[PDB]
């Protein structure tokens, strides 16, 4: 069970530094190279660099030669990528990958790094009630939050059928808003309470809101 | 240093599809080429490495080819689930850097048309207690992926305070979108019926909420 686990989302001001971590497991760390590749929101893939886990030898791309440093801890089997002089084009999902004559079979979940001069804003969760009286929809509105991302679960993760978390809208204010719905039979209205668990990592927001009719 | 790829490739189900990756002597001519698949919402998955080799778990329908400064990805038995962004990569020895392609969006043909499922949510009382009003129009499960959203205040067109999302592909290969009408509580109670009308492929589905 080779698994590459990455750190969490990070928000940084322009001109700062970010350190992302990639813990490798299930194989001999020194037996394979590690690549770092980034994907900007709505764009394609960009290779950032490669690290040799034995001696710490590194090769970086010219675009990031001036802003990236890669390190390794052989004891904990972890690679570390540090990007400095951060700018708005560094806002992206960064991935680590084990080598297979290139970026390979085993990748990481991805770490979203948002570089912005704006302050992080916590979300406001409001219940979205079914309303009129078969299929019906209930949900939670996560309003006026910056930056991304937000994770929404239903009933602490026990509810996974009929759950659709819609993509967020960027308003003119620069803040984001999202809505998460559960589609239920309308015959089951009034009989079950639903709880949305909203998590906004940039603002330490863990809010549980009840949607009941 | 970038290998060039077709922006878009459309092909028919149960047929073979070909994606071409063009490069130079330094990247594809001297070094191995690898092909990756990115389904919407997920991380890149390796499909082919060392020009033709297949990692375990990847079906034999995926095939790899290289010739000179060219690489080719082939998909046999094309299924709807194969709709994704396909990428090529190689090592450019002139700078010493792994170069990726720009991406090729594969679209499977013969996909039926679905009408948007629209749900309109009225402002919450807790938001009304905060002196703000928001109407939430959520559109889901529609194909093709184009939709036009318009709001109406007692049949009068509502122009201001409408923010709509770009369509997004889902796991079912259908698209989803959302529109939000930000109103003041005065604007919410001053009318009798606010409506969200969603137009897809010439048809219109409308939902109405009342204060």
């Amino acid at each position: 069970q080779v698994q590459l686990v990455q750190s969490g989302t990070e928000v940084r001001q322009p001109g700062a530094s970010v350190r992302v971590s990639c813990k490798a497991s299930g194989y001999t760390f020194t037996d394979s190279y590690i690549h770092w590749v980034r994907q900007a929101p709505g764009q394609g893939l960009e290779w950032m660099g490669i690290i040799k886990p034995s001696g710490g030898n590194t090769r970086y791309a010219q675009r990031f030669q001036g802003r990236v440093t890669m390190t390794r801890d052989t004891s904990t089997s972890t690679v570390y990528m540090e990007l400095s002089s951060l700018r708005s084009e560094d806002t992206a999902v960064y991935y680590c990958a084990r080598d297979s004559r290139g970026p390979g079979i085993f990748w990481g979940q991805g770490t979203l790094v948002t570089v912005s001069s704006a302050s992080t804003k916590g979300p406001s969760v409001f219940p979205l009630a079914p309303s009129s009286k078969g299929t019906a929809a209930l949900g939670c509105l996560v309003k006026d939050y910056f930056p991304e991302p937000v994770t929404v679960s239903w009933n602490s993760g026990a509810l996974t059928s009929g759950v659709h978390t819609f993509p967020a809208v960027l308003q003119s204010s620069g803040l984001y808003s999202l809505s998460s719905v559960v589609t239920v039979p309308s015959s089951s209205l009034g009989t079950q309470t639903y709880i949305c668990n909203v998590n906004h990592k940039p603002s330490n927001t863990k809010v549980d809101k009840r949607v009941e009719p | 240093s970038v290998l060039t790829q077709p922006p878009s490739v459309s092909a028919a189900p149960e047929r073979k599809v070909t994606i071409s990756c063009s490069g130079s002597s330094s990247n594809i001519g001297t070094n191995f080429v690898s092909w990756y698949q990115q389904l919407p919402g997920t991380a890149p998955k390796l499909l082919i490495y060392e020009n033709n080799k297949r990692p375990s778990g990847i079906p034999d329908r995926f095939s790899g080819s290289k010739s000179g400064t060219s690489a080719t990805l082939g998909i046999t038995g094309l299924q709807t689930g194969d709709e994704a962004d396909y990428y090529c990569g190689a090592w450019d020895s002139t700078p010493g850097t792994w170069v990726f392609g720009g991406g090729t969006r594969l679209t499977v043909l013969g996909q039926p048309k679905a009408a948007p499922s629209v749900t309109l949510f009225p402002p919450s009382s807790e938001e009304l207690q905060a002196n703000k009003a928001t109407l939430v129009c959520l559109i889901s499960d529609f194909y093709p992926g184009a939709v036009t959203v318009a709001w109406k205040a007692d049949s009068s067109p509502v122009k201001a305070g409408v923010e709509t999302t770009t369509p997004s592909k889902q796991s079912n290969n259908k698209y989803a979108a959302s529109s939000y009408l930000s109103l003041t509580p005065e604007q919410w109670k001053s009318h009798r019926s606010y409506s969200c009308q969603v137009t897809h492929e010439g048809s219109t589905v409308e939902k109405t909420v009342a204060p």
């Binding site: 190279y33 490669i50 040799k52 030898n57 590194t58 090769r59 004559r101 290139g102 | 001297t30 070094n31 191995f32 020009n51 290289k66 190689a90 090592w91 020895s93 010493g96 792994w98």
Partner: peptide
């Protein structure tokens, strides 16, 4: 010219990715 040093990661990688 000498034979590349074993510390030359660029040559080691150009040999790792090369396709004869």
């Amino acid at each position: 010219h000498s034979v590349p040093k074993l510390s030359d990661f660029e040559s080691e990688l150009s040999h790792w990715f090369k396709n004869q």
